[PDB]
Structure 1
Amino acid sequence: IWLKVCAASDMQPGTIRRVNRVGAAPLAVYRVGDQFYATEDTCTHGIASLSEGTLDGDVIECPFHGGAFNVCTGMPASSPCTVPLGVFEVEVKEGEVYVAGEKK
């Protein structure tokens, strides 16, 4: 149900971590300041990896075409992206990062 990803300190502020899942689409965990968020890693506009894009605040910018998403709502922030990203709630307990295994 919940996926233990890593220690909060494993990620510097403003970075993104790709979380692979056997037999499933990869996820991207974003560290925005001291807050953590998660979405599907694949941009809904193509095959780009959002974990290889640029994070500006709480908005992830895709490396391929400049499309963007709000990592909290998963809603498109910039064209050409139109299909909402799958969001996954994350929780940090005892300095450990956990991401819901179910798209919620």
Structure 2
Amino acid sequence: IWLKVCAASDMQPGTIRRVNRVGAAPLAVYRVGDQFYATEDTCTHGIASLSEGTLDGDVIECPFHGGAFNVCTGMPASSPCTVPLGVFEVEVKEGEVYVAGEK
């Protein structure tokens, strides 16, 4: 059920990686420090790719309008975003990053 995304070391701290999924909506994996999180990649306010946004701590800022979400809860942190992001639990085992298939 889980999806093997990459090696933890493939991502530098404070970076975002877009994870495409054939026949499904892309996801975004965020590395906050040594912690990893994942949400839907598409901003809920438009068509922007959050992985092309700015990560500040555990808050991802959308590149289009400055809307933002807490990558841990998926809840909006800044307007104009109002619809919560889909969250996917992530677990790191043996230096490998896995992202749940569902929210």
Q: CA deviation at 1:42?
A: 0.1
Q: CA deviation at 1:73?
A: 0.1
Whole-angstrom CA distance in 2 between matches of 1:101 and 1:33:
23
Whole-angstrom CA distance in 1 between matches of 2:21 and 2:101:
10
**SS of residue in 1 equivalent to 2:51:** helix
For structure 1, list consecutive stretches of 5 or more residues without a partner in the other structure.
none
Q: CA deviation at 1:60?
A: 0.1
For residue 55 of structure 1, what is the aligned residue in structure 2? 55
Pair 1:89 & 2:59 matched:
no
Q: CA deviation at 1:64?
A: 0.1
Whole-angstrom CA distance in 2 between matches of 1:83 and 1:24:
19
Aligned ranges 1:19-58 → 2 under 5 Å: 19-58=19-58
1:15-54 CA distance string (max 9 Å, x none) = 0000000000000000000000000000000000000000
Whole-angstrom CA distance in 2 between matches of 1:90 and 1:57:
17
For structure 2, list consecutive stretches of 5 or more residues without a partner in the other structure.
none
Q: CA deviation at 1:63?
A: 0.1
- The share of aligned pairs that are identical, in percent, is 100
Q: When the two structures are aligned, how many residues end up with a matched partner? A: 103
Whole-angstrom CA distance in 1 between matches of 2:67 and 2:41:
14
Whole-angstrom CA distance in 1 between matches of 2:5 and 2:65:
28
Whole-angstrom CA distance in 1 between matches of 2:62 and 2:41:
10
Normalization by structure 1: what TM-score? 0.99
